[PDB]
Every structure is written in structure tokens, then in C-alpha cells.
Design brief:
Keywords: Calcium, Metal-binding. GO terms for molecular function: cellulase activity; metal ion binding. It contains one helix and 18 strands. The protein is mainly beta. The chain has a single domain, classed as Glycoside hydrolase family 11/12, catalytic domain (Jelly Rolls, Sandwich). Bound molecules: a molecule of 4 linked components (BGC-BGC-BGC-BGC) and calcium ion (2 copies). A molecule of 4 linked components (BGC-BGC-BGC-BGC) binds next to loops.
């Protein structure tokens, strides 16, 4: 009834599938993903109560030494749907067929109910991201003709990579009320093309619905990549990046009670 992963007990890369019907196809996949931490004291723990429906992340890390300061953040504990293209983990038991080529995909809403509690001014975000790859089922990383898209609905003390391009309006739902929100658009070349959308009014808790195609359509429009609509939307990842090169302790807790992807009857890109 309860799934738990823990760093450092489970190794360098704790992770597990959420497979509530035990059918061998996960609905979601969880990872602690401390990808830029070389060593730390303390622990990080992610639990998922299958019975009550709550994901709870608890982190108390100290003595943090990074693998590369130039990566800036320490890690990205997360839950995702689809095929994460950095490893052999995947979750495909859901209504949206990911991976699929962006030219063939439905638009969809993403709704998340959550609460964030970073401690002591820890720099964090709450970021949704997707990777867009040239092959359908990538498991060995990302190339320079591919894209990373993030959507930050909370942040404190972090800025996206690269340069600010523009601001856009995206209609979202916040705590049940539809509302025009503003997103900053940022773009970088970091070994692949990176496009980030950073809300101008961060939301530290509640229920938020976003239209995924509004973001992928702007990412397509501003891209420098050839043949963009041939790329595959591999996954949708939801997690909190945290830390800076100056951060040596990182205590954080969060909860997610619901993630829903709702297909629409319209193309992703418009
Ligand atoms: O699963 C076990 C296998 O793990 C392999 O290592 C993987 C690791 O699982 C995976 O989680 C890691 O992914 C990170 C990716 O989350 C991160 O994304 C960044 C992004 O680059 C950055 O631009 C944006 O700002 O933030 C994102 C979130 O913080 O990117 C880094 C690459 O820079 C990824 O490392 O990828 C690992 C491989 O690099 C082990 O290799 C394997 O042995 C093991 O069996
Ligand atoms: Ca399943
Ligand atoms: Ca994978």
C-alpha cells in the first residue's frame, strides 16, 4: 500500500514505478534524481501512498558537494509520465500516448494539486518539463538538434538558463478560477536547445491546470531547430529543482495529491 524510495539507502539513483493495477505498465514513475550531487549528509525520501493517493517528498541534506557547479542546481526530485530519455525508466499507463511525434499529438491539459515547503530560503522551482527527441524511444540522453521545454509554476531564487526572449499570455486555471497568466519565455543553447516558461506570479500551493500546447506551440515558434514537428514529445516530468552553487544545506518538503492529463480534441501545435 505504500511505495518508498530513499537516498542514499537505495543507491545513487533511487526511483520506482507507480503501478496501482500491478499490470507491468506504470501510471507514473518517481525519481529522487540528485543528479548534480556528488556527496551529502542526511537523506531524501519519496513516498507514495497508493491507498490514500498522496506523494510526499522529504529532504534533509547537508554537507552538499556538487558534481559540477556549472550545472547550478543540485537535483530534480520528480514524478513523470512517458519515457524519460536519460534512463530506462518509463510510465505509459495513461490517456496521452507519449512518446508521440508533436505533429500527431493531441493537445492536453495538465492539472496538478500540490503544496511546496522549501525551508530556510532554499532556492527552488516547481517545474514541469518535456524532452523532444529525434527518435521515438530515447534512453541514452539528448543531442544538440533536440529540445528541452520547461514550465515553472513556482520559483524562489532561481532564474532559467539563457536569455529572456519575451513574455506571453497563457490561460490557466488556478484554484478553480480560469485566469490569464503571464509567462516569461527564456531560451538557451546548453548542448541542446532549451526553452523555459517562467510564470510571473509564482504559485506555492493549490491546484493548477495548464494547456500544454500553448507552451509547445511557442517553443516550436521560437526554435532554431530544423523539422521541429518531427520531434517526439517523450514525457512530462514534474518536480522541484533546488539549490545553487552557494547552497550547502537543502531542506525541503512537498506533496502532490493529483496529476491529471486530459486529452482535447485539437492538435498540440497551433
Ligand atoms: O536510472 C538509473 C540510471 O541512471 C542513469 O543516470 C541518469 C539519471 O537516472 C537521470 O535522472 C539523469 O537525468 C538528469 C536530468 O533530470 C537533468 O535535467 C536537467 C536539465 O539538464 C537542465 O537543463 C534543466 O535546467 O534542469 C533539468 C532538471 O534538473 O539533466 C541531467 C543532464 O545534464 C541528467 O543527468 O540522467 C542521468 C544520466 O546523465 C545512470 O547513467 C545509469 O547508470 C543508471 O543505471
Ligand atoms: Ca499500470
Ligand atoms: Ca526512459
Amino acid at each position: 500500500k505504500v511505495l518508498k524510495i530513499r537516498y542514499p539507502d537505495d543507491g545513487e539513483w533511487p526511483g520506482a514505478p507507480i503501478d496501482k493495477d500491478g499490470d507491468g505498465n506504470p501510471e507514473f514513475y518517481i525519481e529522487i534524481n540528485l543528479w548534480n550531487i556528488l556527496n551529502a549528509t542526511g537523506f531524501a525520501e519519496m513516498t507514495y501512498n497508493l491507498t490514500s493517493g498522496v506523494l510526499h517528498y522529504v529532504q534533509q541534506l547537508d554537507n552538499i558537494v556538487l558534481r559540477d557547479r556549472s550545472n547550478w542546481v543540485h537535483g530534480y526530485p520528480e514524478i513523470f509520465y512517458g519515457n524519460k530519455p536519460w534512463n530506462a525508466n518509463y510510465a505509459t499507463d495513461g490517456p496521452i500516448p507519449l512518446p508521440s511525434k508533436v505533429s500527431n499529438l493531441t493537445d492536453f491539459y495538465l492539472t496538478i494539486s500540490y503544496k511546496l515547503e522549501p525551508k530556510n530560503g532554499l532556492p527552488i522551482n516547481f517545474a514541469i518539463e518535456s524532452w523532444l527527441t529525434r527518435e521515438a524511444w530515447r534512453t541514452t540522453g539528448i543531442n544538440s538538434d533536440e529540445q528541452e521545454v520547461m514550465i515553472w509554476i513556482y520559483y524562489d531564487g532561481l532564474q532559467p538558463a539563457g536569455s529572456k526572449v519575451k513574455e506571453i499570455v497563457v490561460p490557466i486555471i488556478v484554484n478553480g478560477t480560469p485566469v490569464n497568466a503571464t509567462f516569461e519565455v527564456w531560451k538557451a543553447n546548453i548542448g541542446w536547445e532549451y526553452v523555459a516558461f517562467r510564470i510571473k506570479t509564482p504559485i506555492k500551493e493549490g491546484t493548477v491546470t495548464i494547456p500544454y500546447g500553448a507552451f509547445i506551440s511557442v517553443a516550436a515558434n521560437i526554435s532554431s531547430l530544423p523539422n521541429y514537428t518531427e520531434l517526439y514529445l517523450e514525457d512530462v516530468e514534474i518536480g522541484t529543482e533546488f539549490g545553487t552553487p552557494s547552497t550547502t544545506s537543502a531542506h525541503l518538503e512537498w506533496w502532490i495529491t493529483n496529476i491529471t492529463l486530459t486529452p482535447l480534441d485539437r492538435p498540440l501545435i497551433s
